Structure formats: structure tokens, C-alpha cells
Amino acid sequence: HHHSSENLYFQGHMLASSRPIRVGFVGLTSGKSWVAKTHFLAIQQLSSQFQIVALYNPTLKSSLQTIEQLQLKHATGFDSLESFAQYKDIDMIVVSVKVPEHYEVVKNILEHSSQNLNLRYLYVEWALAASVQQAEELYSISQQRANLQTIICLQGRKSPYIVRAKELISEGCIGDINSIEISGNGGWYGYERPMRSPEYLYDIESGVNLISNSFGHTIDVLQYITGSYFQKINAMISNNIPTQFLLDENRTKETISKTCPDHLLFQGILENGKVPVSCSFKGGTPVKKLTKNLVIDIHGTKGDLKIEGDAGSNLVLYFYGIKNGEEEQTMEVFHLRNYNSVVGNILRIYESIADYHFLGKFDKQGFRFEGFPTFKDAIILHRLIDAVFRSDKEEKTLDVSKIMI
Amino acid sequence: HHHSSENLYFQGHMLANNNKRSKLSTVPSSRPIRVGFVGLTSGKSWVAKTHFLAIQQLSSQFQIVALYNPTLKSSLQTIEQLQLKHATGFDSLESFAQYKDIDMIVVSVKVPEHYEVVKNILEHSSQNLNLRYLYVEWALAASVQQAEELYSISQQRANLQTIICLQGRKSPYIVRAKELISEGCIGDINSIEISGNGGWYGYERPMRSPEYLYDIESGVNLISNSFGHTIDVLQYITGSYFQKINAMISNNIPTQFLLDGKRTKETISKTCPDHLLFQGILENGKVPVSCSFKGGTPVKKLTKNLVIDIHGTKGDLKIEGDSNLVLYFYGIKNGEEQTMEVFHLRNYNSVVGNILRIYESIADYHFLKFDKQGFRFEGFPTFKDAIILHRLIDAVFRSDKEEKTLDVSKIMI
């Protein structure tokens, strides 16, 4: 039955350990910040699992206002990361600050939590750091911490669409994968820039660009769905759009330089089955008009699968193959009618966190449906992304056969 | 209206001149191009069903005077079936090649035989001065080495025009796209995506299909052939050669299943490759191009099998199809209100249609020497355009052999 006791936990209920996981945020800046907007709402709907007991803000002011607005019952504000890092009532810390900043902050939290034994979770959003360097460092330092579980937010791995894809792929509904094609669009990196965008997104040294973020979340999901890591790759990155035109109500004559790359060519062979993958990622506008801007097209010996959507988003997964592992094919069209992905995917992550915690330190999620990704998953990703830049710079097809180690 | 005198040219009709510098000014110079074939196997061979029909329609401009066949019985049988009132059968290529009444020789034989054949044709056409045109089907030869050489010899024939059969260039969809881009309709080109399929190099092989096609060693494969035709059409349409490229080739399907057109457990070997990942930078505007070419079956069920998708600044244009092509366009009518055009020919027979167009261009050239057609709308591609494509292709296997991105910035020379 639907309302059976066995389903309480999944309905969000807790019998009377069972205490919520107490969370403390960094980046929960105001009652209208991204975090408010994304992480809070989510945590907000998982009341029996998570409770926010702390906010770190440069001022006690900012944190008091927020606690009132979001109406936070068990929160207490902190003026110092250090102090914040040491509050013994925190089980999990979530960091939501721009990447350029991840390095310091994180490195500091790690440093000042060594005292704190309650702290079992450290959560950070992709990308983990601004450079591979930085990230390997946060990785190594965390590795140092035996009882601390890390998490990276690659929420695309919780997309219903991806899950579904991976189920059909994993269940043999398209047989063996024969070839794969991907198209994506980075949004901010075309001929136009949106009004007031953190110049950091446009800077080559920030470590945030078409490649490290968009393609990154993308190829990661690809690998996830297919169950394989790459063995060899080759890239070509372009900068044919050196100055953008800004817009503001809706496009102006005002110009602005863009150090960031505006196009990525990626092609590689996945290790399992040496399967070929072709990838084309546009920086941004103008968008493609005769075709979907996001497409993940997977071609099997026994069927095909294709995720298409609106890189700006209305996704749909199409499947045509054997509902099985004489062979007879079936079509499937998959589209949720009104799913809030940003909030929803992040939310699933937390549930996943709650589940490991409530139901039952592990390495990474790798290709498992279970669990959540860890800084290890992030690191592997950082490695690849790094090999992409190097392949373009060295003009060579690189073996990345060994970055998951 | 339709049969107006004003429409005569287009209908492939040619009025007599009073013009001194015009072949149409005189009776003798207005004779139809006398054609000699190599490959006219029978009444049911491929040439019969392609080149021959084309010529049949261009009676006013072309005429068959000879065929070569290892066996005369063969050539005499063929002459009877197709009723060629003007054709003599040849026992030997050397004789066929010496025949003085020939104006053009067309070669349609297994690629692996191209080299020797054309090589000898060249060598023996050495006295016939009427020999003005040498027409060969793509691939020009089995390897670039062979190609370069055939090329080299021909260049040295001052009055011999050569023609290569890269008929995709005359595809109406290719011309339409070319016009569109040429005119600025989609602005500056930003990125290109291409997907194709080599038809037989997939999981199962058609019954009675010649082994050479599956022999890595043959010089005939997914790359040299279909990707070949496709990438040349791509550069043709965009008006650019490539700057640098990178390719990764697969052989995940070393053994196929036969068919008749049905499956079996009866199995077969394939050393030819089954997939190609090709990406590169086009010299003009340094535009990125990505491409995925599959070997054959199973055909893609959720997307069209051939797709040429071009993203530019002021618009987009896509040619997609399975022959069944449609060109789609959304962009500025000239070169802000963007328009939509869906271009599609009802029931076009591409197979003969495209080859016919090349013959019409030879005729124009003739009645109304050139290096290569390169990006011109005018004329037809020659051995030189074939040599460049062979070079690109050689570079693709090397780039896949060496695991490096290569510069091809100079193969056009």
C-alpha cells in the first residue's frame, strides 16, 4: 500500500539517530540568495531529515535578517568561518560561494573542523575548485579526514531524465552502445552577454568557462549514464568571439571583451567497448534554431535513446528499443509535466544524503545508482577537464586511461 | 510558356551560332562528345543504370563510340541490349585507348583497379589527339600515392581535361545550401555538425557483397568513400578547406552477419573500420566542425541518417535525410526579419540525376584546360579536387594513426 508504514521515511516521516542532520551554510547570504532560492527550499521540504542550525556570514546583521525571513528556528549566526567551522552542533556543512573562492573557504573549513567530531559531511557545488591544482589539494586534505564524508553537487546525476536513460541503458534496452553524439550550449558565451554578469565568468583565469562548467556537468552525466570513463580524447577550443554585445531589458551597441572560450570540439573513445563519442558545445547565443540546443544521442545495436532540450529548458527523453535486455522494439516518450529541476535535482541529492545517513565513509558514486557523488567524483572530472585543455594546447589525442585511480 | 524558345538552354538544347569562337558556329565542331567506356559490363551493370541513362538524355551532346571488356562477347552482348548504334567493342584497353574517334573516356571499375587502368589509358591515349576528357569515379585511386601519380601524369597532358565523379557537389540541396551561405543568409558561420553512415560497414552485410569493400587493404572503406564524398561537399558548400583536423577510427565490429535482406548466424569478417570521429577547424573564420560517421546498420531510429547542420550568426541551415533529403533554413532573406524556407524536390532521382548534372557541365564547358573547380559553382571537379580530398583523407588516417591533431593547411596546393 501507498500509505503503508514502510513508506513513512520516503514520505518524509521519521519514527522516534532519527534526529535531523543539522546543517550549516556558507553562502546563505540573504533571504533572496541563490541558496535561499535553491538549497533552502529543498531543505525546506525535507524537514524531518535536515534542520539548519547555523549560518556563516561576514556580519551578524546579514545572518540575523536571513534567519527571520527564512524564519529559522534552530539557526545561529557566525561572524567567522573559523568559529562557524567549530560549532559542535553541525553535522554537515554546505558551501555555496563562487568557485574562485572555493579554494580558500574550503581549505579553511577543513582546517578548523578537525576539532569538530559531529561534522560528518562536507558539501560543495561543482566545480570543486578553480584549477585542477586547487582541487587536488582540497581532495588530498579531505582524504586525510577519515570520518568526514564529502559531497560534490553534480545534480545532473539526479535528473529524472538521466536516471531513466541510465535505467534503459543499464537494463539492456538498446543493447550495446555503438556510438554517441552530444551537442550543448554554454549560454553566456556567444555573441551576447547578459546584463551585469560577474566578470568572473568571462575570465580565462577564473577557472569557470564553457569547458569547466557546462561541458563538465555534461560529459560527467554522459559518462555516468553510459557506465564508462574515457580512455582517449581530443579537443579543439575556439575563441572566435573576442568581444560581446551586451543587452539589458531584452541588445546594445555596447561592447565587452571575453577572454573565455566560445566553442569546444571534443571527441573520445569510452573505455568500455571503445565506444566513440562526438561532442559539439556552443558558447551561447545566438541559439540554434533548426535543432534542439541540448541533445544527448545514444545509438545501440538494439535500439536508440535521445535526451533533447532547451539550452537557455524543456527536456524530453525518447526511447526506441527492446523493453527487454526474435526481438521487438517499442517507443517511449518521457517528459515530466512540470518539474522544477534546479530545486528538484539538488533536492534529490539531499535525499540521497539522508538515505545513506538514515538507512545506510564511501569513495565515490562512480557508476552506481545508489549514494551521491563525492569530491573523488569531482576530482576525476577535474582531471578530464584538465586533459581537455591540455589536448587542445598540445594538439594531441590524450590517453586519460588513468585519472580515476 | 514552359517550351518557350527562351527556355531552350535549360532544357539542354543548343542553337547554331554565327560566332567564330563558338563550337556551335560550325557543323563539324558541333558534333556530340564521342564517349568510350570502361565499366560498361552489361545491360544491368552500374554504368548502365547511371552514366548510360544520363547520356541517353543528352543525345544532342554525347554519344557512345566504344566500350572495353575483357571479353568482346561481353561488349557485343551489351551493345545489343542497349542498342548503341555507334559503338565499337574493344578487346584490349590499349586498343580502346588508341581508338581516335573517342573524345572522352569514362572509367567505372572497382577502385582497386583504377590505378592500373587509368594509368594505361593515359599511357596509350598518347597519340589520339581528340582525347580531351578523362572522367573517373571517386575514389580516384586506392591510395593517395597512386592518386598523386595518376594526377602527375595527367597534369602533363596539356589538352586533357580530367573530371572526378564527386557528384554530391551537383546535388540541388548542396547547391541551394551553397547559394544560401554564399549570399550571407545565415551571416558568418559559427559551428558545424555532421553525421553520416557508410551503409555496409555495420553489424550485418548484404548478400553477395564483394569482399574487397571489407578489406582494410583494398583502399575502399567508410572513410575514403562516404565520409570522403561528404567532407568534400561540406567544404564545397562552405567555401573553405580545413585548417587542422583530428580523427579517431573504430573497429568494434570485426565480424558481421550475412543477409538476404534478412539476418543469419552465418558470419563474416571485416577488416575495414566501422566508425569515424572526425573534428577540425576550417580555415575561413577558423570555424569548428564535428562529425560522426557510423558504418551501417542499425540505422539511427531517433534522428535522420545524414545530417549536415550549419549554425551561423544570422541564421541556420540543415540538410537532413535518409534518397530522401530536405534542406531547412531560417535566416535573413538577403546578404533582420528572419525567414523560414523548406527546400525539397519531389521524387528526385539523385543517383542518376547528380551524375547527369556533371555531364551537362562538361557539355557547357565544351560547347559554350582548368585546374580544379575548388569552390566555384561553375564547371565540375577534376582530378585535382580529387587529389586534395585524397590528401585530407590520408591525413585522417595518419592523425588517427599518430594520435595527433594535424595541420592540413597546405594540401590544396
Structure write-up:
Chain A: To yeast GAL80. Chain A: Keywords: Carbohydrate metabolism, DNA-binding, Galactose metabolism, Repressor, Transcription, Transcription regulation. Two copies of one chain form a homodimer. The first copy, chain A, has 405 residues and is α/β, with parallel strands linked by helices. The first copy, chain A, has two domains: 1-158 and 337-374, NAD(P)-binding Rossmann-like Domain (Rossmann fold, 3-Layer(aba) Sandwich); 159-336 and 375-405, Dihydrodipicolinate Reductase, domain 2, CATH 3.30.360.10. Helix content of chain A is 30%, strand content 24%. The first copy, chain A, contains ten helices and 18 strands. In chain A, the strands form three sheets. Chain A has a nine-stranded mixed β-sheet with strand order 17-16-15-14-7-13-12-9-18. In chain A, strand 15 and strand 16 (316-321) form a beta hairpin. In chain A, helix 4 packs parallel to helix 5 and helix 6 packs parallel to helix 8 (210-226). Chain A is globular, with a radius of gyration of 22 Å.
Q: N-to-C terminal Cα separation of chain A, in Å?
A: 44 Å
Largest sheet properties of chain A: 9 strands, mixed
Q: Please tally the helical runs of chain A, counting DSSP H or I stretches of 4 or more residues.
A: 10
CATH topology title of the largest domain in chain A: Dihydrodipicolinate Reductase, domain 2
CATH class of the largest domain in chain A: Alpha Beta
Helix share, percent of chain A: 25-40%
